[PDB]
Structures are given as C-alpha cells and as structure tokens.
Amino acid sequence: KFYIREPPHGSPDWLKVGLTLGTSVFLWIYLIKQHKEDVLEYKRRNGLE
Amino acid sequence: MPLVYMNIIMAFAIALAGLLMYRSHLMSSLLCLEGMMLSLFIMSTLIILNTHFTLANMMPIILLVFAACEAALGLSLLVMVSNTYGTDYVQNLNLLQC
Amino acid sequence: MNPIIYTTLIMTVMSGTMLVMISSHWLLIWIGFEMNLLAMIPVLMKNFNPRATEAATKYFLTQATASMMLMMAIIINLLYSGQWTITKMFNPVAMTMMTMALAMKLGLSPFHFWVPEVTQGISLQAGLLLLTWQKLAPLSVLCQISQSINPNLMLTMAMLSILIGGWGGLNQTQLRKIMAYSSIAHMGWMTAVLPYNTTMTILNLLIYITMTLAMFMLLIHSSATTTLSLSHTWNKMPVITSLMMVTLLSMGGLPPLSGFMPKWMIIQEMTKNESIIMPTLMAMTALLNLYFYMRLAYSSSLTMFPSTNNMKMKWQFEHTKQMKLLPTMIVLSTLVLPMTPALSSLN
Amino acid sequence: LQYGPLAFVLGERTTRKLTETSKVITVDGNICSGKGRLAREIAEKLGLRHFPEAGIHYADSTTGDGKPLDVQLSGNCSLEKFYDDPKSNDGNSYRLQSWLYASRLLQYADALEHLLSTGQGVVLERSIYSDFVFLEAMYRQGFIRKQCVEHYNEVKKVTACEYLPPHVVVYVDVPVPEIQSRIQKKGNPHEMKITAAYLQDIENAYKKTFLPEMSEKCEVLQYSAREAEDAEKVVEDIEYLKCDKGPWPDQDDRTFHRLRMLVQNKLEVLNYTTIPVYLPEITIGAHQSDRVFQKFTELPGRKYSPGYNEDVGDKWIWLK
Amino acid sequence: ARQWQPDVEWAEQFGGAVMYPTKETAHWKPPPWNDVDPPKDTLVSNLTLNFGPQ
Amino acid sequence: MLKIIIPTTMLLPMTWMSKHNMIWINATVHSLLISLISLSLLNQLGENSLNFSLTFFSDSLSAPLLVLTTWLLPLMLMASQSHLSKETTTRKKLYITMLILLQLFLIMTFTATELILFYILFEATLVPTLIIITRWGNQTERLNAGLYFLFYTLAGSLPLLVALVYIQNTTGSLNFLIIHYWSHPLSNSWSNIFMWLACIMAFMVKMPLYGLHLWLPKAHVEAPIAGSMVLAAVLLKLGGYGMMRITTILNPLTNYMAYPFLMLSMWGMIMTSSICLRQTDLKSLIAYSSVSHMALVIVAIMIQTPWSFMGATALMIAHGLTSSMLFCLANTNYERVHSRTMILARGLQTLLPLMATWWLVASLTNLALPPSINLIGELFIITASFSWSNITIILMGMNMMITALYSLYMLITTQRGKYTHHINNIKPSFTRENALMALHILPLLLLTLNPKMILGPLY
Amino acid sequence: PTIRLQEDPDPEDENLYEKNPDSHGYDKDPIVDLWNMRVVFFFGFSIVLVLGSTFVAYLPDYRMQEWARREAERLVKYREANGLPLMESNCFDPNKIQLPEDED
Amino acid sequence: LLDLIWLETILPKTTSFIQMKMSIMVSNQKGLIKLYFLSFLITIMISMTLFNYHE
Amino acid sequence: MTMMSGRPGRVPLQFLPNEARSLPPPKLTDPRLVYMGFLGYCSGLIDNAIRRRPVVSAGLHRQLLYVTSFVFFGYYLLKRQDYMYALRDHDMFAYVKSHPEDFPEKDKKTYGEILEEFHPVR
C-alpha cells in the first residue's frame, strides 16, 4: 500500500536474522561450556571429587 | 640554583603574565606563548646539560617540534578571526557568554 | 570536511588520549596532550560559522596555557630530582603547578569560564565529544599522581566546581550551557574523592559518561538546542521526552536510579576517613543541579507546551539515522543500582 | 545501502552522474497562465522528470500511500476560504502561505534528491525562490500582518540558504486583463472573487523583485503568452544557453555530498519551519495539538514505521 | 473542566537569552536559530598607489 | 516475604498486557487478592519479630502498615478511574504503573532489615509521587507544589544518609537486630548532638513537624485524588516508623534534645487546628488536620514510653484511613462542581443523603469518638504525656476542643443549610463512590472490634 | 486575530446517566461497567472483608497470653503454698553479679 | 502572618532569593577572555602563595 | 589512593588470573545474572519503542541477542567481582595473622562483671 519502495519488504532480511540467531546460540553454547569447565576445574583444584 | 636558573624561571613567569594579560591584539598573546616555549626549551636544555643526561638531550628538540604545531594552530585561527572582522582584536570574540 | 579526514582526526584525538593513558614518561604524556589538542581543534570547527571559530579560539588559548604550565611543572620536577617517570612528584611547587594545569584542562573552578562558552559555540556532536572523551586523560594523570596531592587545593577546587556548576546552571535557557554546568559540577564530584579512593573516581566518571552520552544522543535525536525547541518534541515523539525525563531524574541523583550510586559511594568513602562536613555540603549543593534538571523536565515532559501548524508535516516522516547504542545507554543510566557491588571489579 | 559517509568513502561520487542535462528548470508566471502545460512539454521534450505544483496535500502523496489525508490532520488551511474571506480573523491566509512554503521546500528537496541520486533533470512549476511574491500580494492588500512577513522572512532566511537556485528560470508573461478573462472562462466560482489589484501586486512583485534578482544567478527566459504554445521553440532556446555564471559550476564533490545528505532525511529539511516563534495564526494550543496528534496516529498506516503496520497487510513483523 | 496546560505567555518565560533577566542582561539577544550570525560588512579598503609619472 | 512482593511485580505486566477496556477490573481484582494474601502477616509473636531472611523481617509495628498499603491500592484504583475516562490507554496504564511502583516501594520499605536499604526505598518513594502530582494534577500551581514536595524532603534526608554511613563505620553494622542488641549510650557532646539532629530531622520533615510543614498543603491540594490518598494515608507514616526505629540508638541524648520538637509539636497542633477554623478551601482543611494529628504522633514518639508507642501506632493507622476517606469525600463534590471553595456548594444533605451519612461518619471518626481506634491512640498518647508532665493536659485538652469544632464546621458548611440555587448539575451518587466510602469505613470499626492488632510491638 | 493561538473550546462534562439510566458509574460500556461493579463488590466485601475478618479473629495464640497466664498461676500457687514472696525485687541472682571492689 | 508570610520568608523564600542572586552573579559574564584570563592570573598567584608556600 | 594496583604478582590487563579458577563459579541461576538478563530485555524493549515498532513483538531475534549479550557479560563480571572480594579477604586475614601485636584478643568479660550506667526514662 506504500507509495514508495519501503526497503524493508514483507519478508525479513534473512541474512541478518540468521546472523543474529547464530550469534545468540553460539554465545549460549560457549557460556554453558565455560560454566561446565569452570565447575570441573574448581572441583579439581579444591579436591571435592 | 645559580642565578641563571632563577633568571630563566623569571622569564617564564613574565611570559605567562604577559599572555594572561591581554591588551588588544591576538598576535601579541601568540608571541607570549612562543616566549613561554622558548623559556621552557632553555631551562630544560640547561638542566639536561648540567646533569649529563645523554639520552635526554633529544627531548628539547621534540619540544620545539610541538611548539611549532601550536604556533601554526594559533596563526590559522587568527586568519579566520580576521576574515570575520577585519581586525585581530580579542574584543570581537564576545558572541559567547557564561 | 571529507569523511576520511574526519575519521582520521577522531582517531588522532583518541590516539592522543591513549598515549596519555599508556605512558610511563612525562614527555610522552605531554606529547599525548599536545596531539589530542591539535586534532581536537578542527573537530570543533566542523560546521563553519563565527561562533564555532570563537569557541575554537578560546579552547585553544586555554589548553595551550594549561599545557605550558604542565611542561613547566615537569621541568621543575626534573630539576629537583632527575626523574621522568610519572610518580609521587618529588617537589611540592611542581605539584601545585601540575594540579593547577590539570584543573585548567578539566574545566575545574575557577578555571571554568571557557566550558559553557565552548559548549555553546559548537554543535551537539562536538559537545558530546568534548564533555565525554576529553575528561579521560587529565583524570588518568590525576589518578596516577594521587599520593602526592595537596588535599586542601583539590578539595577547594572541587567544592568551588560544585557550587559554581549549580549556580551557573540555574540561569540557563540554552541546553548546551546546562550540560556544561552539569559537567563542571560532576567534575567537582569526581575530583573531591580523588585523594581518598581512585576507584570511586573511576566509577563516578563511568556513570557520568553513560548519562551524558544518553542525554546528548537524545538531544541529537530531537533537533533541539533550546528549551523552547525541546518543548515541541512531545508533539512529535513522546517516548523520547519520557526517556529524557527519566534520564534527567537519574542525573539529578535520585534513588533508586543509577545516578545515586556514585555520590552515595563517595559519601561513604569520605566517612571512612573523618571528612564529615564536606560530603554534607556537596549533597546540599547538588540539590541545585537537581533543581534545574527538574525545571527542564517540567518544560519538556511533565507539561505540554503549545505547538505550531507546520509540525503536522513532520508527523509524516521518520528518523533516518538511528543511534544503535541509545537504548543500552538509557538502560545503563537508569537501571543499574542493584549491581553496585560490581564496582569491586574496578580496582 | 543507504547513502552516507561510507557510500561516499568507497565508490559513489555525484559529479560523474551529471551529464549536461541536470538542469533544474522552473517555469514561473501569474495566476491562470499556461505555465503547467509549458512545464509538461519541456519535461517531455528534454526527457526530465516533471513535478506538478506543490499544493496543500503534497506531503501526503509522498508518504504512506499517495492518497491525501483530511485537511484537519494535514495543512489545516483552505485556498477556497482564502478566496472567499481573505481577511478572516482566524489567520487562514498566513497559515496557508506558511504551509505552502513548507510544501514547496519539501518538493525542492525531493527534486534535488532525485537529481543527485539519478542525474536526470527535473522541471518545477514554482519554487521557494518564487513563493514570496504571493506573500507580498497578501501584504499590500492588507490580508496579513507585518509580523507574518517577518516570520516568513526568518524561515526563508534559515531555509533557502542551504540549497542551490535553479539552472534556468522560465517566465510566462500574461496581461492582467487576459488573466481575468481566463479566470472568468474557467468557471471556478471562488477564483471569480480575485480582484485585479491582487493579480497586479503579484505581477509587480514578480517583475520587480523575482526576475531582476534571479537574473544575477542565471539568465532568465521570458516568453509572452503567444510565444509559449510553441514548446519546441522554447526547448530549442533552452538547449542553447551558456550556463557558467551561477553557483552550480563551482560545486565540487564534497559540497555535493553535503547537499545529498541534506536533501534526504526530510526532518532535517523541515527542521526550521517549526521555530518557536508564537504567532497567533500558526500557534496551536496544547489541547488541540494533543487531540489532532492522537487522531493522526489512528490512521490505518501511521501508528508504526512504514513496514511494521500489520493492519494494512504487513507480514513477518516478529522477524523484522 | 480540563487540565491546565501552558500557553504562549507561560512559554515565553523560557524564550529569552537567560532566565532572571537584569538591567545588564535584558539587552542580550538569543542566538540565531541556526548558529550563523549575519555576515558583517567589514570594509576592507584596497591600497591606492600612484604608478608614475616619475 | 517474596510471596507478597512478587505478585505486585506481576501486577505490572498484567496491567501492561491488558485489553484497553479491562485494565481497571484486573488491577482492582488482583490488588484485592494481594491484600488478602498480605493479611497473613498479622500473626505476630510476643518476643521477637518474624525474621523471614537476611533481607526482610516483619515486626508488630510494620505489619498493620503493610496491610494498610495493600488495602489502599484498590481504593486508589477505584477513585482514579472516574477523572481519567477521557485519557488515552497508554497514559492510563502509566498512571496505574506509577501506583503499582509506589506500592512496591512502600512494601519493601516497611520490611527492610538494614537502615540503608530502608533509606533507599524510603527515598525511591519520591519519584512516582512527584510524577503523579506534576503530570496528572489539575491546576497550574501543581508544578510549584512538586518542587516544595521534593526539596523539603531531600534537604532533610541528605544529612541522614551521611549519619547512616558514619554509624556503619563505627559499629560495623546497620542491621536493626544487631543495632538493637549491641546498643550503646550516646554521650553529651556537640558531635553527638549533630548526629542526633541528622538522624532525626529527615523523619521530622516527613511527618511533617510544625514549621517544616509548608510543603504539605501545597502537595496535598494540588495532587490528584489517588496522590492525595497515598500522601495522607501511608507516606506520612514513613517518618513515624523511621523515628520509632532510629530512636533506639539516640538514648540518653533524647531527653535533652527533644524539648524544642515537643514544644513545636504542641504549639503547632494548636496553631494548625486554629488554622482549620478559617479555611475557604476544603482540601486545605483536611491537610492541616493531618498536620495536627501527625504533631500528636510526634509528641508520642518523642516522649518514648510504651503507652506512647502504642498510641502512636494506633493513631497512625486510624489517621491514614480517616484522611483517605475525607479526601475521597471532598473529591466527589469537586468532581460534581469543579471547584474547591467550601461555601460554593451547600445543603448537600438534601440532594445526597447517603453521601451525607458518609460525611457524618468520617467527621465523627476525625474527632475521635469512642471507642474508635482514633480515640484509643489519642487517649494513650494523652495519658503518656500526662505521666511525662501534668501540664500537657492543657494543650492536648485545647486541641480536643478545636478539632471537634472545625470537623463539625466542615460538615455544617457542606451538608446542612439550603442548597445553592444556580447549581443544577448534582447528579445522584454512583455505586462506585458509595462502595469506596464503605470500603474506607468498615475496616475502621472492624479494627475497633479487635484493637491489639494495631497497637504495635509494645503490646 | 485578537487571539493568542488556536485552541479547542472547553468541552462540557458527559453525564453517565444520560445513556445508561442505571450506570453504576464505573464505565461507559454497560457490560464492562456491570462486571466491574460485580468484581469490586465480590472481591472487596465477600472475599477480603468477611473472610479476612474471620481469619484474623481465629488467629492462633502466638503472642503466648494463655501460656503466660497458666505459668503465672503455677508460680503464684507454688509461692503462696511455700510461703515465699510472690515477686522478688531482683530478677537476677546476686550470686552471679560482681559489684565493683571499691565504692570510696 | 505565620504560615503564609514568615514561615515562607525564612526557609524556602530566603533560599530561593539567595540561589537566584548567586546564579545571576555567577552567570553574568560578558564572554571576554581578557577579564577571566586576568582572573586566572590572580588564581595562580593566590594558589602559589596560600597552598604552595605551606607544605 | 589505589589499594590493589601495586599488589605483587598482578598481571596488568588480565581481568581474570589463574588463581580465580580456584573459586566456585557463579551459578547460571544466580539472581544477579537474572537481573542482567532483565536489563537486556529492557534494552530490547526500549530499542523497539524508539524506532516506532510494536514494543513487545517487533524483533524477537534482536531481543534474544540483547538478553544473551547482557547475560554473557554479567557472568564474567560476577566472576571478577567475586575474585576481587576473595583477594581482599585473603589479604586481610594474612595481615591479621602476621601482626598479632596490632590485633590483641583481650579477656572476655561477662555482663555480670561490667558496670553499665542506667538512664531512666521519665
């Protein structure tokens, strides 16, 4: 209905959306792995298990 | 200190007072700025030569370099000011207040 | 001005600041100040008009005098002890010269007269740069030489800065001058706690920088440089004026907003030494800054001023350039107090 | 990618797109003269984009959908009621004049943006440099106050200094009795009330201020009524002009970059139209402003950004 | 029957160059809308020289 | 006690996610449910407090205040929705958000175990109130009122903060339990005198103390109805609660220090009661009555006896309920006639009989008719003052007279006489207004039925 | 124009009884208004008021008043039977108190 | 006499009057570099004398 | 006054020394981390509001990225803060242990032996 192009089209910018979602999932995976390694390392240093 | 050290510091004080007290011209204040730079160069050179700090012998030269920049900067501004008013009077730099 | 040239000048300003911040030699710190000033002068004159030229001239004169006094202090210190390292400043006269020169560079009272004039004479972007980035280097040097400071001189200048900032800002209808006076008062607050704890100085500087960035970005978003210009914004973008009001509330120092965190901590620190009277006076004086922030909030957000007819056309268009860091800056400037203990990561 | 400093740093430069037919053209003339037909013919022969004269609803045609909006939410002025009651006590005359100046400024920005983005020429009917004559005709007839003229002069001073004047100014000269006869034959019942003094004031304003001062920026092509129908002759006269006297040849690439950043971002264009000068003719109280703004925000495609209004058929919003 | 909102008279308090005007500052003017002052007609006379007859 | 705090933070998105025509219903229903939940805090012990965690605790002094706050929220919701009908949906949600934030801050304030957290919340209560007053007030003086409301508070509370941190550098803790158990006497020195003043003057300005009360008529007259209700009902009691908490560290310096505040409070209750006799504005009369009652509470806290503390608690709760009811009563007439002049509308008992009955009950409870808890608190305070010095019965006695006068004066000016002839738009009372009055008044008599629940920890 | 600006005239107040003769004064929508009245009356009077008063009235004795009464009765009985004084002026045994050595 | 005049005169009105007067004093500068650079000279001399000489 | 900058063994720009690995890491359900995620959500909402988009529904990927970034930064911020407080406690205890003359544990007296002045309230 717009009289102009309205560069943002009906479909989203799939490249940017994919990049955003990929960055989020990569960050979450890295955080989970880092927390696991931190817990194991602390348990090793203090000799709990 | 000897008499030379106090003489150089007195010259620096005189140049600082001369800059801080404006009369009419911006060029006179720029000249006072260069006078302060010259006094600083002389004092630093005397201190470095007296104590035989070999690697510090290059510091005054570096000082001079940046002095030139300051001078050039000031002159640039002066030109623009004159182009606005036809004079280099500091009385015309009063569009902004506190 | 070319975009490439503008980028190069901004990078040179930043590089001068980092050269001051990473150096161990007094000559290199002075060189960083020199390079920063040389690159900063054209940034103030980016949009050419007589007012910008006058502001640049005043800024240059002030900073050149301050740099010359800085060099004199360094030379005297070298004379009385052949030391070039930035350290406990073995001579008291050189230390007084250094304190006065750095105060002139920072805009601390009574070397404050240039700040409102320069801020008023330049654009909002240059004012943002001057009031945020140009504080880092002198404050870093002051933090480094804090052990040999004379508490009387800096405490006098800090109290004068707070008083003069409040009183001067009380009289302003121009937004840039209001920002300049707020900057003077916050400079006083940051320098008051320097002889006691540099971590508090860093925390206060960070919070002030965040708040100032958010304020200036909101002032750029709605093209207002006066009170009456800002009084039209509600008829175009009400969310902007609402966020502006909450930001002004935070800058006023009211709990539970983040602007309360620095002063609070600073007061606490000053009571760990004896120092009871000075924090009380500082808070009572900061009430003035709160007052003129509240007056601005009255004018822009809490009441609706009359508008013009042509505003209707502005309803049909949108903001093209969008600042990406504005929402994060607003959130950090308002909702950060519960994370106060994280300041331990600063030391 | 959106034009900006990055687009200018690498690649994009304006001066290469100018191909000797950039040639901003404006065709001026009094009321009811055939300047629109001449403009359309000039644009057709020279292959330039024609811009119909900016009216009350020009801004509506360029945003959202091209359909005009209600006069209450757009313009808040009437030309017909200006003809009926030129001395209305609600300040309709100066409100209409100010809105028309703002619309002309927006149209000039659009034309300049098109020219600088594509290199294709543009033809306009009237411009911000020509609007003032009508204002003068309002002032000499006592239709508006002197403070209205002062406010108009302030807005014009702060706005028109940021753009370039047209390359060639075409004028069509028609005698006042002939204008009156054309209006009589037209049949519109409102234009019948235009006194000969108003048209005479417009003609004096034109021939004494507009053409003499626009002749210094560039040469002016004046044509009588009879020699305006031969459009091919006018076009061939246009093709043989030596344009090396105005500011246009002295424009290098950086000033073009600045102008291109200014012409887009229409909020920057319209910034100084709403300066906080409180004239009763154009000042609106807080209550009416609030009501009209709330009414505007309820239009079918206006509450959100152009691509985010799901009530006009916008899809995949939650991934934009 | 409706909430009070500021009018032109109220809004004009904030339109001057300063709050709390005094006899000294009542003659100050607010800056131009764009920060561009009108260009001064600073007459820069050209040097007049006699070339000849000697 | 997160079981009460979390439901309010859930009230927030429920309001912001509600349909445009269902905000009031949802807010009222869930506020009432939260009040019902908070009713469980009344089961208190006889020796120590209910220590929920390291951060929150409930005492016998704070539980009735929490219940009063959670009960007041639905009343303000009901009162506000009449004059906000023409307001847009977003602004209505913003108003409800301000009210919810105020209630959350008050709830967290009344249960903080540390004094600094109490300070932070007791100061955070300022922002929503100021926004409400300066945005949704009706006249032009509201802006000025806001300023008077703000700085008057901050000038009193900024020194307190300093004192607070100083104390933590000396004793090592601000936890109220550790402060109570490790209490030490205060010596008679200038430093201790100024520490006392710093600790006391913030709460004094909050009550407010006579001579420091000029902000209150402005703020309570210029604010909207919900703002007035919350200002008079709960926000004044913060000063009393804080003073009763902080007096544990000020002994024995208190006996010497209190004298000027005691004389100010007694002569000021006399003066404010006298001021109420000549007032052309109906809201200002209620404001000055609030000042008089709070002066009585100041005397009660200052003389520092168990009976005085019970009287202070009972009087605070009773005054909160009564003042909220009176402000709502005045607002009904104001909404009818769009004016606050007291002699403009007369003889309203002829046109609105049940509204006149509500007026009568509110005026009766204002003058402390027995056996209402108003009279219980007043009599306990008077007995404690008599034990303190037998001459006080003079001043208190005079107050007991003047109060009644102005109270009945108000009634006689508004309800009796003959109606104004030219006022022909007095519509019949709505169900909403009558229900608001009933929900104000019934808890008062129910509390009279069981008075030990509002008598504080000294019981 | 002899005027200062363009403003809307001050509107007259709307009477809720004009469109709804039984309006309850809650909302202009009759169904929404009726349900607002219903929820306010049910959750204010029926739920919070009466049930809350019943809950508070039967609150179990944690203030330990009956316990204190029974303990007092036991102590009074024992002291009266054994001939001891009912109450002692010292709540702490003097054997555990060490007064200062010198009072001069 | 008391509530509307003197209690107003002492606490809030005196404060407002003093703050307004000091604001007018502080912010009334013509913007001439000559004057406040002279002030800078005075400040430097005073600081060298009062604080620097007492160490 | 800088307390910890000159502490021996400090690496200039480490932000997390190896010794900090000896401490328990903050739990992923730490309420401070939840508050940081709440801050990220608020930033996303304000970003939607400023750009004139549906505040709650405009960009789910953008809001997710905001929340994730805030949580990711907050985790390491909390780690460093806990490390700093542990260092402070360790240094305090070591200094107290190594200077017994400055921290004497004097005799403890029962309340039956201390004379406290009594100030009657009347």
Ligand SMILES: CCCCCCCCCCCCCCCCCC(=O)OC[C@H](COP(=O)([O-])OCC(O)COP(=O)([O-])OC[C@@H](COC(=O)CCCCCCCCCCCCCCCCC)OC(=O)CCCCCCCCCCCCCCCCC)OC(=O)CCCCCCCCCCCCCCCCC
């Ligand atoms: C302490 C405890 C926790 C609380 C934390 C603190 C509070 C919350 C955090 C604050 C930030 C949150 C929201 C930020 C973005 C708001 C921006 C906005 O405009 O909102 C409009 C937006 C509505 O816009 P729309 O839907 O696009 O269409 C309407 C048009 O936009 C129509 O819009 P318009 O532009 O045409 O209307 C113009 C209007 C628009 O102007 C505004 O809307 C003002 C908004 C300013 C945001 C606040 C500034 C930055 C944050 C600082 C907060 C300070 C808190 C400290 C206390 C001091 C109080 C100031 O401006 C005016 O009318 C001027 C009126 C003057 C009033 C001045 C008062 C403003 C300050 C009030 C701040 C109160 C706190 C925020 C409350 C939430 C507000 C939405 O509101 C929302 O829908 C979002 C709010 C709710 C989202 C969260 C719900 C999550 C999902 C529900 C499920 C819950 C999950 C539970 C978990 C367990 C599973 C069961």
Ligand SMILES: CCCCCCCCCCCCCCCCC[C@@H](O)O[C@H](CO[C@H](O)CCCCCCCCCCCCCCC)COP(=O)(O)OCC[N+](C)(C)C
């Ligand atoms: C409209 C027409 C009206 C007139 C007609 C009315 C008809 C009659 C109705 C009136 C009833 C008369 C009352 C007479 C007294 C009977 C009730 C009394 O006996 O119960 C008391 C009990 O009353 C309750 O304790 C008091 C009610 C609690 C009030 C709480 C208010 C509800 C919360 C709402 C929010 C509050 C906000 C304010 C914050 C503080 C006794 O207390 P208690 O000695 O123990 O009981 C001993 C036995 N127990 C302990 C085993 C139970």
Ligand SMILES: CCCCCCCCCCCCCCCCC[C@@H](O)O[C@H](CO[C@H](O)CCCCCCCCCCCCCCC)COP(=O)(O)OCC[N+](C)(C)C
């Ligand atoms: C108002 C909110 C303020 C927030 C400020 C901006 C937040 C985002 C900025 C991100 C910081 C990037 C740093 C991470 C990269 C690693 C760099 C690291 O090596 O730096 C170390 C140090 O790490 C940083 O200093 C920590 C920065 C953390 C800032 C957050 C603290 C804010 C206080 C609490 C407010 C709540 C925060 C909420 C976060 C969203 C170097 O230590 P050191 O060289 O030896 O110290 C130099 C200074 N000395 C010597 C004088 C002491």
Ligand SMILES: CCCCCCCC/C=C\CCCCCCCC(=O)O[C@H](COC(=O)CCCCCCC/C=C/CCCCCCCC)COP(=O)(O)OCCN
């Ligand atoms: C709207 C009205 C609100 C305004 C009321 C504000 C006034 C509040 C009262 C003054 C508070 C100032 C005290 C600040 C905190 C003191 C804490 C403390 O204990 O410090 C003392 C020191 O006490 C002080 O330093 C206080 C000095 C006062 C300085 C500030 C003066 C403020 C105005 C004083 C007069 C005001 C009187 C009350 C207000 C009257 C109403 C107008 C001990 O410190 P040491 O140095 O270690 O002593 C032991 C070893 N020598």
Ligand SMILES: Nc1ncnc2c1ncn2[C@@H]1O[C@H](COP(=O)(O)OP(=O)(O)O)[C@@H](O)[C@H]1O
């Ligand atoms: N700036 C203006 N002020 C007043 N009237 C204007 C203005 N611009 C255009 N008009 C009106 O537009 C009407 C027709 O415009 P015109 O261009 O002369 O005819 P045409 O559409 O045939 O080219 C005229 O009645 C004229 O008055």
